[PDB]
């Protein structure tokens with residue numbers, strides 16, 4: 001019934017769109033914040049979409065619930081532990097999971113998100129708290145888990161507190177820096193706070209990932225590669241608009257973090273046309289399959305493989321190939337990965 005019953009790797013999914021309805025009220029309703037609702041069953045259908053909204057429709061979704069968990073310590077650790085638990089029900093042996101500390105914070109961060117007031121919920125406490133619930137999740141649900149912390153494009157002021165959090169919490173449990181948010185902002189990749197954060201990353205050996213080529217042209221993908229020095233791309237569908245960049249990522253073994261079901265609802269991929277991942281799969285690309293914002297997309301990893309089985313023709317050696325290139329591209333330290341790759345060869349034949 002589920003498209004591909006075997007174990008899985010996932011590398012692109014955001015904490016703060018992978019929170020449950022239910023604990024959206026429990027913190028919501030405890031905290032009064034208060035929502036479009038009071039059933040734990042109909043947040044879901046409002047802050048979950050069915051069809052391609054726009055950018056502002058989309059960010060406004062964050063506005064109802066985010067203010068219910070950010071700010072409250074209890075809920076930062078809650079959503080950590082509960083996240084691990086979804087991945088095991090999805091049949092995932094390794095997940096890298098991501099988020100911005102700033103967006104959980106309530107103290108120590110200009111500007112203050114989600115309209116909230118002051119506080120003592122620090123950015124650094126947020127990372128502390130997330131690590132926790134992540135770890136109790138590896139031990140309870142038996143998924144191995146690392147995190148990535150996420151620069152916001154519009155906010156290059158944060159970025160250096162970012163790379164530094166990434167060296168503070170190194171291995172316990174953060175493996176990488178990300179860049180995200182809205183790739184529309186002209187020359188965002190190239191803001192000095194973004195560039196120096198990634199340079200520092202290189203200096204002190206944090207890994208690197210970048211969201212690019214999703215709603216954004218190929219030149220944003222070339223700046224992620226050549227200036228920011230990433231080792232993998234968040235999405236990168238626009239790489240195909242630029243063939244020489246292509247042939248070279250293809251020659252370089254770049255890994256692309258695909259969200260196919262995300263690519264519909266966001267507008268990244270058009271209904272009429274070519275699917276980026278079919279092409280990437282006719283060309284034997286280094287890519288992976290990924291959920292992204294499962295709240296907001298009303299979905300599970302099975303949504304994604306279903307789609308790919310049930311339209312774009314995926315055999316199941318695809319499925320296996322792609323989960324192999326995924327733990328190959330992972331940001332596990334070198335023993336750890338060989339160990340993961342083991343698990344998966346055992347399971348796959």
Ligand SMILES: NC(N)=Nc1nc(-c2ccc(CNc3nc4ccccc4[nH]3)s2)cs1
Nearest residue numbers: 014016017053054055058181182215265266
């Ligand atoms: N959990 C996540 N994704 N964090 C954050 N993401 C933003 C993002 C802004 C623009 C993004 C990419 N562009 C984008 N445009 C969209 C239209 C419809 C649905 C989704 C969309 N995402 S993600 C703000 S905070």
Ligand SMILES: [Zn+2]
Nearest residue numbers: 014211234292
């Ligand atoms: Zn993303």
